[PDB]
């Protein structure tokens with residue numbers, strides 16, 4: 001109940017400041033003013049982050065995984081995942097995927 | 103008593119942000135052989151108040167926006183999440199004692215990237231949207247090292263609780279066994295927060311908030327400066343843990359605060375010393391220097407406790 | 418004025434339109450509340466708006482012209498319009514959805530009262546509603562712009578320059594023939 | 597004679613390669629930069645406390661033009677127009693006639709201070725030290741018309757600044 | 773007390789804020805921009821008065837026209853002025869921006885920036901010393917301090 | 929009937945003025961920077 005009440009305050013306060021910051025200026029009554037080409041490299045960096053992010057999701061439970069009695073199995077699987085994550089980086093690296101020159 | 107607790111957290115954060123602008127301007131001035139603000143109030147203490155009043159009574163700038171609803175959503179998200187990342191921090195007792203506090207902070211900081219993205223859309227400027235895409239790409243890229251580096255330090259702590267980092271460091275700061283990670287973690291917080299030498303959004307002759315001027319621009323500024331303090335508070339808890347005496351909690355807060363100020367000052371220290379990276383060069387720093395080393399140190403920090411019999415407790 | 422300064426020169430213009438006018442910009446700020454309230458439905462109200470530069474050029478030529486002392490002029494536009502047709506044209510040029518609905522004369526007065534309680538420049542008032550819905554008089558016994566060498570500017574020619582800033586091949590409005 | 601700025605070969609002995617490896621991995625040269633700005637934090641700043649402190653000037657300083665007098669009050673200017681003929685910006689306008697007592701004096705002496713390039717050629721060309729550039733440099737105005745000086749403004753400046761113009765001329769007339 | 777007194781203190785507070793946070797946008801067009809840079813240098817340190825070194829045009833409160841304004845550049849300068857959020861002030865620095873200066877009689881020079889934009893302070897010199905420009909910024913602050921926006925509104 | 933007096937250098941000239949680059953050599957060697965770095969890790973692991 002505290003967390004729900006904590007999130008409500010932070011965004012309600014942020015909401016109040018945004019609206020008054022939009023309206024408090026609008027009382028000076030100032031004079032009336034009366035006055036992209038797709039890049040495939042930006043997409044590739046966004047996709048690569050996603051696939052690395054999904055690998056990070058699998059690595060997040062490692063602190064709990066080290067409390068098990070099958071450490072020989074757990075350490076093998078943990079290092080396998082991290083290594084395969086390195087292989088992906090090695091693959092993109094060697095295929096000019098990390099470059100920015102057109 | 104809890105509602106009073108939230109205000110005892112929110113209000114000082116905004117006052118800390120307010121006077122960080124003053125401290126940043128004087129510190130840069132003295133490293134530049136200048137004085138910085140010293141006229142508006144004694145020693146410039148009233149300079150933040152003058153700027154605040156001036157900004158909030160200046161003419162609105164909002165031009166035609168295609169997603170006016172998205173124009174108002176971005177500052178709310180940016181400032182709502184910036185304050186939300188403080189509630190689990192142990193100082194020494196957290197406002198919301200979470201069992202998964204570390205994951206909560208990663209999750210909330212991975213949503214602040216929407217404020218950048220939504221502000222680019224709501225500006226009706228094809229050259230502002232390109233700037234936002236670059237800013238988004240940099241932020242998500244350095245979120246990869248923050249999570250892997252953070253995961254490597256928790257394998258010595260044993261849980262995602264932020265309060266257990268105090269126990270883990272009761273004999274020794276984690277920086278000593280994990281200074282290679284602290285070096286990369288610290289620079290990631292610079293790139294994550296878009297601070298020099300990584301502030302290519304301020305490449306005046308080389309931002310997505312241009313469509314915000316005064317008012318909402320002031321709110322984006324507060325959110326950004328609130329995250330610098332939070333990141334440097336997170337760094338202190340993670341690598342410079344303070345001793346906690348249950349009968350004298352205020353001793354922790356004094357020592358903890360001093361550490362978090364020095365790290366915040368060092369951000370200003372760095373901004374005064376270096377030129378900034380090209381966009382491709384700060385990407386090559388992450389993908390071709392930090393990520394290879396972070397992955398290698400994650401393998402090492404998974405196997406190290408096992409081979410030394412130093413696996414930490416789950417509880 | 419005609420008694421204190423007999424040789425004065427009284428100018429009588431209609432609703433002047435221009436970049437900073439309160440006439441075409443007035444029929445473009447009824448979008449944040451709903452449709453377009455009007456006494457009747459804009460019928461039985463005839464308007465003859467005049468361009469701001471025509472009024473300005475007329476006042477200048479009255480200073481230079483000797484045979485304008487002690488005289489009254491009626492600066493009016495070239496064409497006459499119905500308030501419904503005129504307002505429809507304004508929204509078409511400004512690319513705004515036009516949803517006209519009638520509103521009682523007394524009902525328009527009350528919302529005028531609501532908008533005149535503010536301490537700033539009221540958006541609208543009771544008097545403003547009356548003047549917009551007043552029919553522009555036809556005084557053919559007064560010399561107008563043509564008597565000072567000024568060709569009245571049609572509203573269709575120079576309405577885009579005013580309504581360009583309200584936008585997020587337009588048919589000219591139907592006009593009353595001289596008959 | 598000449599020198600090469602960037603024509604040195606880095607050593608490849610293992611120690612030097614490791615010295616460069618330490619610099620790359622441990623950021624040693626980036627930490628000297630931090631030391632050089634921490635030094636400046638503890639140096640006294642060069643800022644002065646304007647307007648209570650002023651930046652140093654010299655007797656030759658070229659500031660606001662002004663018209664001078666003899667010790668008797670008579671104007672020094674005898675309407676010769678040498679200053680007008682040498683002004684590169686054509687900022688001086690002079691008209692003259694015989695004064696009531698037969699003297700040769702100006703009826704107009706205007707300087708468009710927005711055309712003037714504050715070069716001092718006029719005070720070089722004047723044979724009687726009439727027009728000078730005083731030491732004043734704080735006469736910013738709020739309208740463009742206040743910078744179009746006529747003979748009254750310039751004579752007022754001379755009476756207003758003579759005490760300081762005379763001492764600046766006395767300090768530097770032997771170099772000119 | 774009287775309404776004028778109450779609304780006169782609010783005028784002072786907003787006047788104080790606006791002159792204590794004068795953020796300039798410097799149009800550095802010619803040599804006068806060097807002296808503008810010297811006003812930011814350590815000796816004068818304009819940032820100690822609250823005058824930031826260089827703000828973006830959309831965050832700026834005052835425009836410093838420091839240099840020669842040519843016909844080719846005139847429309848660009850007007851556009852930047854039209855995009856400045858209010859309140860906005862213009863400082864004309866040097867003889868070129870004041871009245872054309874050395875190039876007054878040129879075919880390609882605007883004879884004073886006050887033909888394109890309104891000017892609040894004229895700073896004479898070629899170039900004005902960094903101290904003369906600073907004296908002109910402190911005069912603009914004194915000019916903001918004398919504003920009576922709320923008194924005029926109250927007495928309307 | 930005094931002597932000529934203009935701005936001249938003092939008899940014997942001015943003192944020497946440095947211009948060559950002076951960036952002093954600081955810090956330890958690469959070997960000793962890694963030895964301290966590795967040693968810090970080992971003590972922390974212990």
Ligand SMILES: CCCCCCCCCCCCCCCCCC(=O)OC[C@H](COP(=O)([O-])OCC[N+](C)(C)C)OC(=O)CCCCCCCCCCCCCCCCC
Nearest residue numbers: 282284285286288289337341372391392620621623626969
């Ligand atoms: C038995 C032991 C087993 C375990 C041992 C595990 C550790 C072994 C030692 C590992 C080496 C140490 C790694 C350090 C990180 C290296 C990152 C890297 O790639 O560097 C090269 C990178 C890239 O180097 P580069 O640009 O010259 O190019 C390298 C690659 N080539 C040459 C091919 C192009 O450099 C940087 O990271 C600099 C980033 C900019 C930094 C600007 C801010 C400086 C701020 C300085 C203060 C920092 C304080 C930090 C402390 C914070 C306290 C909380």
Ligand SMILES: CCCCCCCCCCCC(=O)OC[C@H](COP(=O)(O)OCC[N+](C)(C)C)OC(=O)CCCCCCCCCCC
Nearest residue numbers: 778779780781782783784785786787788789916917918919
């Ligand atoms: C009740 C309505 C709220 C506003 C309250 C008044 C604040 C504005 C006055 C300060 C600026 C000013 O006055 O400038 C600085 C003044 C001197 O000004 P001066 O040269 O004598 O003014 C000359 C006349 N002018 C201004 C018309 C040209 O220094 C002072 O001694 C003020 C220091 C005390 C300020 C205490 C503030 C407490 C209020 C906090 C909550 C709002």
Ligand code: SF4
Nearest residue numbers: 683712713715716718
């Ligand atoms: S100082 Fe130069 S520009 Fe000014 S009046 Fe004298 S000659 Fe003309």
Ligand code: SF4
Nearest residue numbers: 673674676677679722
């Ligand atoms: S000021 Fe001097 S140079 Fe100029 S007209 Fe007078 S006497 Fe001649």
Ligand code: SF4
Nearest residue numbers: 802803804866867868
């Ligand atoms: S006024 Fe003088 S210094 Fe300034 S731009 Fe013109 S010539 Fe250059």
